[PDB]
């Protein structure tokens, strides 16, 4: 395999000008300062940038890059995208299941993983967890060895590494690059970009492409880079790192002065006399949804302290609410305590559904890398993560609250009233979580979407029916009560519970109320708030929460589909 | 000035063993790997560690280090502790005002600053803001030049720099160290510790102290460090950085093998034959409170988008609440709307006082550095920041809410009822902010104290009197209503507003109520909640909020006084 790129003019501002050179099979490196082209040429050569800005051609063996190029070449991210809560065996099985074909037997795929994990030297850590904040795991020198193996499953002919040594120690970074030089003798063209290497690193290369401010300033063998700048008019002292010497020339011991020296070289004309020699899904939907939902569930189990901790809070707060509101009375205080516990239960399900912001935000760089590499669709990534994370973690507190507090408080002792309350708390937990995903999908910070959820809740909670009476608001504000999730949950719990209730002891007021302004029955309270007494007045509130799940999970789908993937 | 340390055994685990050496006036450097002693020896030599673990002696010119050593030597933090919202002129005036004596004239101090700012080369940026997230400021290469000047005001004989090049670029880091070599010829002993230098850096040194895993592995002139390891049995190839060569030996191209080679040297015995030659507040309280409160107020003005943004939210939410609750009626819905707007106003003052967590947390590393250096006391730092940040930012929304919503809603149209409401909203804003400082003082992360404030508020807000009736709770829980800030604010606003009110139109019920269970006057509502109708029943709530300000601002003072400063 030989890359051969020619006359690239990428634009967003033209931050690349014209870069030429071939990349033979060996150990190729792209050096230079940070703001130059060392990170932009690599994303052009690996098709990780938008082709609307690309101008020149990139050729492989005389044939252009097809649409199958992103699946047949491995790109390795700078920071680790490995699942730290799965093991090294399990991370390579997920990559093997969604990239290899479905024809291969599980006996065939497990031997392909055993060839990779033996080649990398991960035999002693093959069944150890990679590591999280809450889990002691494999060290950072072998998280980088793991992520190389997730890209070697399909046996690519071309590897693209993005800063393979940034973030590692000095003794670690030689162990990664001595692994890569053994890979380069197998015939795999390795193309990477190192931030400020050392001479123990620089002595191993086979080609060098030096870039600064979008200008090609050297391309050729890396051994001849020192003798080139000596013959340009510069001098390297003794005991100096040559890779430190090259960026010293960039900063002025100018750019248009030194780029024109490369045009008049014997290296540019030899490259120019080579480029003219050459020029002149995979997987079904149900298999992608099976493995996305399987890995997302092991993550939910392998992180107990954000999953167990929400069940402990639900049980403890369910017992504190059951003790403060222990058995409710049918007296003058009985309307206040029932309307106050049902207001606390619906606005707890809303504010505790702010943790759904974290679902699509933490996994953003792993969604973008795996979508371009071609593991899954957006549709099976979206449905497979709703099925595994959002669905069981929002059913369980809605059951635990209702089982604890219903018989301590002494709510309406019927069997159908028990399950309407469990179902109403469950729809208000989904509708508030779908709203959190409709805001957080696509973003990369948590703190702005967390604040915007909280601002929207405190306006939905004025219009819920406890603080202001909704029949008294002016007609040009009163249409805003239709846009609020705690209104529909608190109307359906109040309708469920206040029906056959009397609240004036010694006064039968359901046949006639003597001396009004009294509120002696639960229908009088419920009409005074503006709630319909028909059985459609209950289930109007559930078809309005179900229509907000479908709208908010479609906005959350289109924000991942229309995302900037490049 | 010559430092001369001898046989240091620091313990928390003995992570230093025995380190010897003198430091003559020049440009001294402390290299090695990160976990070794390069960061721990510097904090011992500058008295920035606890003397309970220190064993050996540190001597200056034959005299031990006094308690005046931290005031007569300059220590420079790694990351910038400069106020990015003040200018370079203003940051040096704050350091000159609290470190120089009060005898000196302002004409004398401004010439001392003009000597410093001309020596550093900050003439073109002398009146430019240093820079924040919201302000375009001076670049990071001259934030480091500024912070050196904040320590050169008292003209110290000994400078201690902590990583003077980590975080800077390669062209920048030579400009800082060429500044330091000009300082070293004036007679200032410069003692620093660089993470992985370059040969353009290494060629400038005058002494070298190489440390790894708490063991002294070289101390002598930095030119002779290369010839020492050649004679130890190692070989440096051509074009290799010698500073990269030294940490290559540490990692194994062992520690107890290579530390014993230094004991048998001609450099250790020459050091050993030198140590036995030698061996054998300032400022008043009112001046510290003047300048702490002055800088903390310029920060409040120079950051408008966290100060103006809380006034915009107060005006906008004050108009939204005034439109939903526009003029209140004395009908059956009148009790609900008055008890709901007064519950929203007190629990808004609590949850918007979570931004007081940010007060003592963001300024933590600048409090610890300036307390050890001896600028101010803990008492004048605490009072000078309550006076400047907490006091005016919690008066203003309590005035803006009360001026907007009082006459739109049509609350009790008396002059004393207008100012009791303004004063009750102001005491509940201080008491919730003092509670936020009593939790956040001493901590260094925001997100744990922000969550712990929010958990405590939602339990204080059940016990406030709207959700559960406080006369109905069991006697073994009902003592918890005394520990809640929204209870005392919402009882004092309900007492203020529900006194002379009638709520049943056509029914005079203040002489006698025909047909009870009615709640036709505001005293009947107010006794039913458990509120005393005497004028002490109003002001009991304000002496209970004033006693929680004094308790929570004493817990917040003792958490800064008893903090681990080392």
């Amino acid at each position: 395999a030989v890359l051969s790129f020619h006359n690239i003019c990428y634009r967003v501002k033209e931050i690349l000008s014209n870069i030429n050179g071939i990349m033979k099979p060996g150990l190729n490196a792209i050096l230079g300062p940070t703001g130059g082209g060392k990170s932009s040429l690599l994303d052009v050569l690996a098709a990780r940038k938008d082709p609307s800005g690309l101008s020149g051609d990139v050729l492989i063996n005389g044939a252009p890059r097809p649409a199958n190029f992103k699946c047949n070449s491995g790109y390795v991210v700078q920071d680790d995208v490995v699942m730290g809560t799965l093991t090294v065996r399990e991370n390579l099985q997920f990559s093997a299941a969604l990239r290899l074909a479905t024809t291969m037997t599980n006996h065939e795929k497990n031997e392909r993983i055993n060839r990779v994990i033996q080649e990398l030297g991960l035999d002693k850590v093959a069944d150890s967890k990679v590591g999280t904040q809450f889990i002691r795991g494999v060290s950072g020198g072998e998280r980088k060895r793991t992520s190389i193996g997730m890209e070697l499953i399909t046996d690519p002919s071309i590897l693209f590494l993005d800063e393979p040594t940034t973030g590692l120690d000095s003794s670690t970074a030689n162990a990664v690059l001595l692994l890569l030089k053994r890979m380069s003798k197998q015939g795999r063209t390795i193309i990477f970009s190192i931030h400020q290497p050392r001479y123990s690193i620089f002595k191993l290369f086979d080609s060098l492409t030096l870039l600064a401010s979008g200008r090609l300033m050297f391309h050729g063998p890396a051994q001849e880079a020192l003798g080139y700048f000596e013959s340009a008019g510069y001098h390297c002292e003794a005991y100096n790192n040559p890779a430190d010497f090259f960026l010293d020339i960039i900063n002025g011991d100018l750019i248009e002065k030194l780029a024109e020296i490369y045009v008049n070289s014997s290296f540019y004309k030899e490259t120019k006399a080579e480029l003219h020699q050459l020029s002149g899904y995979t997987t079904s939907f149900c298999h992608q949804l099976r493995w996305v939902s399987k890995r997302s569930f092991k993550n939910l189990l392998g992180n107990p302290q954000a999953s167990i901790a929400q069940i402990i809070v639900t049980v403890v707060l369910g017992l504190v609410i059951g003790a403060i509101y222990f058995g409710l009375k049918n007296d003058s205080t009985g309307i206040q305590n029932r309307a106050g516990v049902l207001f606390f239960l619906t606005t707890n399900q809303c504010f505790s559904s702010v943790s759904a912001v974290e679902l699509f935000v933490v996994e953003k760089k792993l969604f973008i890398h795996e979508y371009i590499s071609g593991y899954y669709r957006v549709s099976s990534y979206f449905l497979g993560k709703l099925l595994s994370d959002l669905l069981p973690m929002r059913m369980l507190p809605s059951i635990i609250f209702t089982c604890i507090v219903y018989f301590m408080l002494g709510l309406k002792p019927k069997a159908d009233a028990f399950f309407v309350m469990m179902f109403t708390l469950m729809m208000v937990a989904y509708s508030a979580s779908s709203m959190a995903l409709a805001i957080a999908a696509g973003q990369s910070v948590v703190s702005v979407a967390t604040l915007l959820m909280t601002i929207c809740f405190v306006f939905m909670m004025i219009f819920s029916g406890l603080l202001v009476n909704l029949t008294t608001i002016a007609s040009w504000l009163s249409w805003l009560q239709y846009f609020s999730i705690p209104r529909y949950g608190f109307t359906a719990l109040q309708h469920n519970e206040f029906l056959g209730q009397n609240f004036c002891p010694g006064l039968n007021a359901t046949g006639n109320n003597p001396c009004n302004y009294a509120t002696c029955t639960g229908e009088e309270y419920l009409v005074k708030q503006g709630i319909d007494l028909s059985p459609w007045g209950l289930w109007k509130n559930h078809v309005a929460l179900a229509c907000m799940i479908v709208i908010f999970l479609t906005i959350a789908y289109l924000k991942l589909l229309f995302l900037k993937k490049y | 000035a010559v430092l001369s340390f001898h046989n240091i055994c620091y313990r928390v685990k003995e992570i230093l063993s025995n380190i010897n050496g003198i430091m003559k006036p020049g440009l001294n450097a402390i290299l090695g790997p990160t976990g070794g002693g390069k960061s721990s020896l510097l904090d011992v030599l500058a008295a920035r560690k606890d003397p309970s673990g220190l064993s050996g002696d540190v001597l200056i010119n034959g005299a031990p280090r006094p308690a005046n050593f931290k005031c007569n030597s300059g220590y420079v933090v790694q990351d910038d502790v400069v106020m990015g919202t003040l200018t370079v002129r203003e940051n040096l005036q704050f350091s000159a005002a609290l470190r120089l004596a009060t005898t000196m004239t302002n004409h004398e101090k401004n010439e001392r600053i003009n000597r410093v700012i001309q020596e550093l080369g900050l003439d073109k940026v002398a009146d430019s803001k240093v820079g924040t997230q919201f302000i375009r400021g001076v670049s990071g290469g001259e934030r480091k030049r500024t912070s050196i000047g904040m320590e050169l005001i008292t003209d110290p004989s000994i400078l201690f720099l902590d990583e003077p090049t980590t975080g800077l670029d390669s062209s920048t880091a030579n400009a800082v160290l060429l500044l330091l070599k000009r300082m070293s010829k004036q007679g200032r002993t410069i003692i620093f510790s660089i993470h992985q230098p370059r040969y353009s850096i290494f060629k400038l040194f005058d002494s070298l102290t190489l440390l790894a895993s708490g063991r002294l592995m070289f101390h002598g002139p930095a030119q002779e460090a290369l010839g020492y390891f050649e004679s130890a049995g190692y070989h440096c190839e051509a074009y290799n950085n010698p500073a990269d060569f030294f940490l290559d030996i540490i990692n194994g191209d062992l520690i107890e093998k290579l530390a014993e080679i230094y004991v048998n040297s001609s450099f250790y015995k020459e050091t050993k034959a030198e140590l036995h030659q030698l061996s054998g507040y300032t400022t008043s309280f009112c001046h510290q409170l003047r300048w702490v409160s002055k800088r903390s107020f310029k920060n409040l003005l120079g950051n408008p988008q966290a100060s103006i943004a809380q006034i915009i939210v107060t005006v906008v939410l004050g108009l939204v609440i005034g439109a939903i609750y526009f003029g209140l009626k004395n009908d059956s819905t009148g009790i609900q709307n008055r008890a709901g707007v007064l519950f929203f106003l007190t629990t808004n003052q609590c949850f918007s006082s979570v931004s007081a967590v940010e007060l003592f947390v963001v300024e933590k590393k600048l409090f610890i550095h300036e307390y050890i250096s001896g600028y101010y006391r803990v008492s004048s730092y605490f009072l000078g920041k309550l006076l400047s940040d907490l006091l005016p930012m919690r008066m203003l929304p309590s005035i803006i809410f009360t001026c907007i919503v009082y006459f739109m809603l049509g609350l009790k149209p008396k002059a004393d009822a207008f100012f009791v409401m303004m004063f009750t909203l102001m005491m509940v804003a201080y008491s919730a902010s003092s509670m936020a400082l009593a939790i956040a003082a001493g901590q260094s992360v925001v997100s744990v104290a922000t969550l712990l404030m929010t958990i405590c508020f939602v339990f204080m807000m059940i016990f406030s009197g709207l959700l559960v009736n406080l006369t109905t709770i069991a006697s073994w829980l009902s003592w918890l209503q005394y520990f809640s800030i929204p209870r005392y604010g919402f009882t004092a606003l309900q007492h203020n507003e529900f006194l002379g009110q009638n709520f049943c139109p056509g029914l005079n019920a203040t002489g006698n109520n025909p047909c009870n269970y009615a709640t036709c006057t505001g005293e009947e509502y107010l006794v039913k909640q458990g509120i005393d109708l005497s004028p002490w029943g109003l002001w009991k709530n304000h002496v209970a909020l004033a006693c929680m300000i004094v308790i929570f601002l004493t817990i917040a003072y003792l958490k800064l006084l008893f903090l681990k400063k080392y």
Partner: antibody, heavy 118, light 107 residues
Framework: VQLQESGPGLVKPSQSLSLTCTVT?????????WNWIRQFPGKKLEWMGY???????TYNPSLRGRISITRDTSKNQFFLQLRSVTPEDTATYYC????????????WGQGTSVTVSS | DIVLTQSPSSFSVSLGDRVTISCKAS??????LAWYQQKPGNAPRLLIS???SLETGFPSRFSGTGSGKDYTLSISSLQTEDVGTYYC?????????FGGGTKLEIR
């Protein structure tokens, strides 16, 4: 307990209409609410608004800005002031009494007819 | 608001006969319904309060039996002194509305 309307029985269009109901046998500042009801030709009753025993007032939203009810507690009178009068509201105006605890318009006036013509 | 409908706008009965007047509301009134009788040339007079109770000064031939939104007035064995116009008022919500009125006649 004993109510009696009085006022001009004819009024020019778009000026103002004033009535007066003098209550005997009861004090208007003591207990009830005191209101005005009109009955159109082609008889349909229509409530206009009340003044409370404590001076508070409440009006019908279909009569927006045009109605105001005042009282004179020195001699037990309450007043109807209906301004910018159309020739459509040539009704019969009544003053009545609202018990509050019972909820119904218990006592009624005699009724005076107002014709709005030119 | 709440509009009140008396769809039988007239009747035609004889003496000793039972007649029934219906009143329909556009909202839940919760027995806050009153009935009025207006002789020709007089103010209306309260007949029933609270949709069931009867006022002191009326025979026990009138009765109201309503619930929810359907309320009704029954005049069993009417005399000559019972011909008039019958109105229904709600006093639940704050703009108190009346019904259209129904005018009894004698065949």
């Amino acid at each position: 307990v004993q109510l009696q309307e009085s006022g001009p029985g004819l009024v020019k269009p778009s000026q103002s209409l004033s009535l007066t109901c003098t209550v005997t046998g009861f004090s208007i500042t003591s207990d009830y609410a005191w209101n005005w009801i009109r009955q159109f030709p082609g008889k349909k009753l229509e409530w206009m608004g009340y003044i409370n025993f404590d001076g508070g007032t409440t009006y019908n939203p279909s009569l927006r800005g045009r109605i105001s009810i005042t009282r004179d507690t020195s001699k037990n009178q309450f007043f109807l002031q209906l301004r910018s009068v159309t020739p459509e509201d040539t009704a019969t105006y009544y003053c009545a009494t609202f018990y509050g605890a019972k909820g119904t318009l218990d006592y009624w006036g005699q009724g005076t007819s107002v014709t709005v013509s030119s | 608001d709440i509009v009140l409908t008396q769809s039988p706008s007239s009747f035609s009965v004889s003496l000793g006969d039972r007649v029934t007047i219906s009143c329909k509301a556009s909202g839940y009134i919760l027995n806050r319904l009153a009935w009025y009788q207006q002789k020709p040339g007089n103010a209306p007079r309260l007949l029933i309060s609270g949709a069931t109770s009867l006022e002191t000064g009326f025979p026990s031939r009138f009765s109201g039996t309503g619930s929810g939104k359907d309320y009704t007035l029954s005049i069993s064995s009417l005399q000559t002194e019972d011909v008039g116009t019958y109105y229904c008022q709600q006093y639940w919500s704050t703009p108190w509305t009346f019904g259209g009125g129904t005018k009894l006649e004698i065949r």
